[PDB]
Amino acid sequence: PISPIETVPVKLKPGMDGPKVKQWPLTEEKIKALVEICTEMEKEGKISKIGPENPYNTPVFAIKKKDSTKWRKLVDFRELNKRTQDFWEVQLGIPHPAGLKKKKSVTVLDVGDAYFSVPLDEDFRKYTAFTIPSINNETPGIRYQYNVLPQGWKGSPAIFQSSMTKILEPFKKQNPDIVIYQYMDDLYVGSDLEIGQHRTKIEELRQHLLRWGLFLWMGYELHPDKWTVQPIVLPEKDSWTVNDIQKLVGKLNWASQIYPGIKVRQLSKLLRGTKALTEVIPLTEEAELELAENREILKEPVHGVYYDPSKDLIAEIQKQGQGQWTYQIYQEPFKNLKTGKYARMRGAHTNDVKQLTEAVQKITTESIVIWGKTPKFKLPIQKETWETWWTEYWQATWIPEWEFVNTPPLVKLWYQ
Amino acid sequence: PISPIETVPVKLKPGMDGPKVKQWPLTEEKIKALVEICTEMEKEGKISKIGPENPYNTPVFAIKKKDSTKWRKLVDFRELNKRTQDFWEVQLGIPHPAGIKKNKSVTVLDVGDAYFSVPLDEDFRKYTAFTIPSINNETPGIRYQYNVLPQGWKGSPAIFQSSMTKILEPFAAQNPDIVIYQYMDDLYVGSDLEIGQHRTKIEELRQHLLRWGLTTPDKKHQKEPPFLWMGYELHPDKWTVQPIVLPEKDSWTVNDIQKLVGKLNWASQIYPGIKVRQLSKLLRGTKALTEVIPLTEEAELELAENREILKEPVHGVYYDPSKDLIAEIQKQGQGQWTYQIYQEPFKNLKTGKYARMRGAHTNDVKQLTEAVQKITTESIVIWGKTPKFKLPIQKETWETWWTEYWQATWIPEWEFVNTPPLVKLWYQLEKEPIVGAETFYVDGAANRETKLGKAGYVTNKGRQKVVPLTNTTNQKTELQAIYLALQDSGLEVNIVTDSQYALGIIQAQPDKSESELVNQIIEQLIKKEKVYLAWVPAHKGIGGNEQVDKLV
């Protein structure tokens, strides 16, 4: 058991009112589970009803976790999280573990609970106002307020950072070769052991987190070594067509704006003149060399690619068909800090949006592990279609920001 | 021994203070009439007299309805309302008949009394002060302040409703077999049981409100079904929009056609088939609602269908959560789709239409999709669940589309309803180049200043063409050039363009656009057997792009 008798002095930012965010409709079943959940939460004083004198409101919906089919309450504190994260000093997020992204494996623990044993600044509680909607609006919403530290609030991890540091000392001082990070209600633990000897030190981290206080039996396995800026690649054919060359030249033209030394003069010189698309063109001397020299320029790494802790990370995803998706996290155009390709876990999964949504999650999880801050996505979906379904496949206890690209990137296949 | 109605802590907006609005000179009678009202009130406990301290006066007036023998006071709180904080008015959306379970019996209870049992925040009453001028300005004006939610105050409803629900909350909880909608001075209750038990439980209730001293007019709800609410007609098992027929005129102004669109739009909720396109094609950037614009023959043949489908009233049923909830969409035409949501054949809980997002390009499938979505939420909102869709589109079509569309896309559970017109893809571009088909290198270019350009192509078979164009754009030509290659070519053809733009307009497989050009291109595509579009980077001198023929 554990709980602090004091509440850290919290306030919003200057000239910024509270989150008056509209609540979006939820399906009955989600509403039922939210009602039950919010009950025990009241019979444990984590929350308490409020009146009409509270104008503020935050979205709230239900989800399920990775494997378990038990309804969890997720609150979209985005709108607050920005206005609320007025500051954080010497409780500052966390010097980012540049070593976390280097360990063979990494597990993701759920320490969201520990938060619910810490009072909140009385004068602040009015800002965490959320509503359990009513089907059809037949009855008014069931508003509530928070007394304990709100999960998903980007303040809770900061406020609790004090108590947290200690619940770990006996463990950290023990295995100093291990790195532990904390983003939201998530505890990221990575090591350099055997997947089997990895589970070990972790079971020690649960049996330990139990007595010091705290679904605490939930973790994920990552592998930060398998995360790079993938190389761009040109074909290796013995027989080239006008189309093949036309595309090759098209791709090098694009990649030229990322790597300087890319020359195409010689390659297209063998195109000159209205030839048919399906005709075979042989490679010349100049060509063959030019291609080769171009690959060489491409095997190296792009230059001047640096992260800027201040600025925000852009993230693009492109649907490639057959359940394959491609992405690239960056801050400045043509300066990817990372690029990947999400695969097929569920075979002939006839659902693009479920995929997109798992994609966005993994991509975000990675972004937290690398730079300790989620990216801003550019999703290839219609705002309309996305807002109607994502929450039905979401499982993370956090939520990135996102916009919608409604113009087909020519790029789709180059990154193929 | 009454139980008190907990008061609601109310304060003003941050940094702002109260009303110092001057009192306007009245008339002997009014000032005298007010004294009448005002006295009775305080006698009842509503208000009270205040001293020379309280400097918060709010201007009061005095009005009589129309040809009356009674006077009615009117305290203008506009000043205090713009200073009072913000409340959570739980009226962010009224219910929908479609989503209401049938009630065998439904009572009503006037509570225009209880309202006066709900106290105004003690530390706030002072702000609701007003003064009754006295006669002949030979004395101080009588000063009063409220001890109960004012009839025109910002936070009155918000607090009245809250207080009430909190009082009902525990009763509704032990009586799941009833419903209680709190619309104003009326308290509508419904149940589904023997007309005997009903009335009784209504007593079990009237008794409840009595524990807070809340007295009510003996359920002699002067009312009784049918009820007219927010434009509907509710009965024990049916409902419909209040009869608002389509006028008979010859003088349709920007307003007359604007006050016929909302009627059809609102009528669209239940009358199957309401359309408003050609009548929406008569108001775009206008403003002066007086400018009487002509009724095109397009909007005419439309308004004539409206008038006849609006003759035979159509009723919507009630929601029975036991049965399946189904929705059907039909392509009307011109970005027009109309749907019907029902649980049993023809007993539509509600019906509707969808108007294409006025985008330069879009095809039938993208729309069918947008509608499905639009419907989907609206159903979550109303019934808390997704309906099963019946759509005019073969599974096979849909698949080909979502599996090939560049964007992510999805449609909840649905089945193909063969009710023509069917939605379809009109053509598909080859994924690889076609062997043996002529290869058309096309290109176009206009002149920024002279608006003069050329469009044309050159091929492997020596075939050629460059056309001169007046009044055109460096994008237009690029398209015409494809138009040409499509016109002068066989049933199969490989086209090559350096237009990033022009490729995009077709990578979206639009089946209809605003631009007539794009449309003949389409019409052209549709006619072909196999088409392969290929792009190459411009100005890189690439074998084929030796269409220095347009720059000329």
Ligand SMILES: Cc1cc(/C=C/C#N)cc(C)c1Nc1ccnc(Nc2ccc(C#N)cc2)n1
């Ligand atoms: C939205 C609503 C408006 C009014 C009244 C608004 C006004 N004016 C009255 C009630 C009781 C309700 N709420 C609900 C909730 C569930 N079932 C019902 N059933 C039901 C309601 C009316 C009639 C009738 N006639 C029959 C059955 N009503």
